[PDB]
Structures are given as structure tokens and as C-alpha cells.
UniProtKB/Swiss-Prot annotation:
Cellular location(s): Cell inner membrane
Range within the parent protein: 222 to 307 of 450
Domain PDZ: 2-87
Name used for this protein in its record: Regulator of sigma-E protease RseP
Stated family: Belongs to the peptidase M50B family.
Domain notes: The 2 circularly premutated PDZ domains act to negatively regulate protease action on intact RseA; mutations in PDZ 1 (PDZ-N) have a more deleterious effect than similar mutations in PDZ 2 (PDZ-C). A 31 residue insertion in PDZ-C (between Val-41 and Met-42) domain inhibits protease activity, whereas deletion of residues 203-279 alleviates the PDZ-inhibition, allowing cleavage of intact RseA.
Species in which this protein is naturally found: Escherichia coli (strain K12)
Disruption phenotype: Essential. Depletion experiments lead to cessation of growth, elongated cells and limited lysis, as well as decreased amounts of sigma-E. Not essential in an rseA deletion strain, when sigma-E is overexpressed or in ompA-ompC deletion strain. In the latter has severely decreased growth at 20 degrees Celsius. Accumulation of an RseA proteolysis intermediate.
Consequence of substituting I26Y: Cuts RseA without previous DegS cleavage
Inducers of expression: Part of the sigma-E regulon. Also has a primary sigma-70 factor promoter.
Summary of the function given for this chain in its UniProt record: A site-2 regulated intramembrane protease (S2P) that cleaves the peptide bond between 'Ala-108' and 'Cys-109' in the transmembrane region of RseA. Part of a regulated intramembrane proteolysis (RIP) cascade. Acts on DegS-cleaved RseA to release the cytoplasmic domain of RseA, residue 'Val-148' of RseA may be required for this. This provides the cell with sigma-E (RpoE) activity through the proteolysis of RseA.
Length: 93
């Protein structure tokens, strides 16, 4: 299991609207823990306009949020985008 920490949540984004903040850890997505960051990336990219149910940990306490990716231009199709930068060496999603 992994629990990715957020480094930045862009203003005026799906993630900011969802109430996410830097320091939050994503512990569950749609009722199941993440084991790879790429899984979250694909779930966001593939699902513009859909409601993703998040469980996060905030300072060690659980919170539930609803994240709805915005539709943005993609290389082959429209993709979802939420405006999150994870802690580490990954690209924004």
C-alpha cells in the first residue's frame, strides 16, 4: 500500500474545489487503497467529469472528499486534470 503526500494543490482547480491541501495523504480511491501513483494518474486522466471518492489522511485524521476532474486537451483524447503536484519526482496530474 502507498499513501501519496500532496506537495501543491493549484488554485482554481478541481483539487482546490474538492478541498484538498498540501500535506494531505491520499489513502483510498473509490474504496480501495492505492498501490501505485500511476493508478491515480490514469483514473484522473480517463475520467473527466466523473466523481472520484477520496479518503485522505489530514494530520493523521481521516476525511472523505469528492474529486471531479476537469476536461482538458489531451494527445489523443480529452483527459481529466485535477491540478495536483505530488511530493517526489512525478509530474502534475
Amino acid at each position: 500500500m502507498i499513501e501519496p503526500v500532496l506537495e501543491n494543490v493549484q488554485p482554481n482547480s478541481a483539487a482546490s474545489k474538492a478541498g484538498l491541501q498540501a500535506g494531505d495523504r491520499i489513502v483510498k480511491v473509490d474504496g480501495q487503497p492505492l498501490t501505485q501513483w500511476v493508478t491515480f494518474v490514469m483514473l484522473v486522466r480517463d475520467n473527466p467529469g466523473k466523481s472520484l471518492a477520496l479518503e485522505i489522511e489530514r494530520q493523521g485524521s481521516p476525511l472523505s472528499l469528492t474529486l471531479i476532474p476537469e476536461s482538458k486537451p489531451g494527445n489523443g483524447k480529452a483527459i481529466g486534470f485535477v491540478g495536483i503536484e505530488p511530493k517526489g519526482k512525478a509530474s502534475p496530474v
